[PDB]
Symmetry: C3
Subunit: 118 residues, 3 copies
């Protein structure tokens, strides 16, 4: 999984261990190994939501599978909870998009995932 | 809807009200509430186009619906016009990608849009 | 094609000609004109992979076509090679996602690509 978290909160408010907690949470929720999870944090961004600069997080999650309708309810609960605890965001200021990728559309280790598997 | 605007133009050239105008324009063009539109601006970025640093804006629009073939002509006209007026970019330096998302693939307010609707 | 390269390597380690080389390589591999290739570099980013801050590159490639199963093997090899030569990344620290866009979903020159073509 590849995760991008963008917030208008300053970097100061995103704790040093946030990426590590998000990695653990998604490893468990998605049944994926930590060694295949990347997290990018962009803080202090110019973001509006509803045309106001209230604190907000916009999150993108890409994965090959583990993104069923039921799975995404669980991932959303867990990610939203982490944002509430660590960033003090309200739930209506956490926006997540999930991209369920075909293995022919992911390169890793010098080839596609499709070309590396049975 | 979630909109990301990246440009190699300096932040100076992207006026303070750009996000607000883009919000209004897309609320009207897509028939969605302003309160459900997020805009991210990344200015002063390291971007090339044609392998040199000519001014460019690269825009991503994610939405559940309101992204039909006909809709996207309209959105493109309006977004491009705003970039012409406010950033002084030519229309061939405004590149937009639209992602039409299934409601099971969007989390908001602690659950998926599908599960809430 | 619209290409986004995010790395936790400092900007210093991403040479000034990286975008130019990537443009040429993808123009050739994807049979697309240089004048329709944009490359964004985000360097010095807060990125973890496997919950560590080891050097990593996360790359997104969007295009109308030129992203078949076979094409993507080739693109992955060439992009990974460039990252090895210029950024000194190991191949298991280069992650690429490919998005194959319908022409109705791309705005360019003030209209959609679909609306501008035969």
């Amino acid at each position: 999984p590849m995760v991008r978290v963008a917030t208008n909160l300053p970097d100061k408010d995103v704790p040093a261990n946030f990426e590590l907690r998000l990695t653990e949470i998604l490893a468990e929720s998605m049944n994926k190994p930590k060694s295949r999870i990347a997290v990018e944090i962009l803080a202090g961004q110019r973001i509006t939501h509803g045309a106001v600069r209230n604190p907000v997080a916009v999150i993108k999650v890409e994965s090959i599978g583990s993104l069923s309708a039921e799975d995404n309810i669980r991932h959303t609960e867990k990610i939203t909870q982490l944002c509430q605890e660590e960033l003090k965001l309200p739930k209506d200021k956490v926006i997540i998009t999930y991209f369920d990728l075909n293995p022919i559309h992911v390169g890793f280790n010098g080839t596609t995932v499709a070309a590396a598997t049975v």
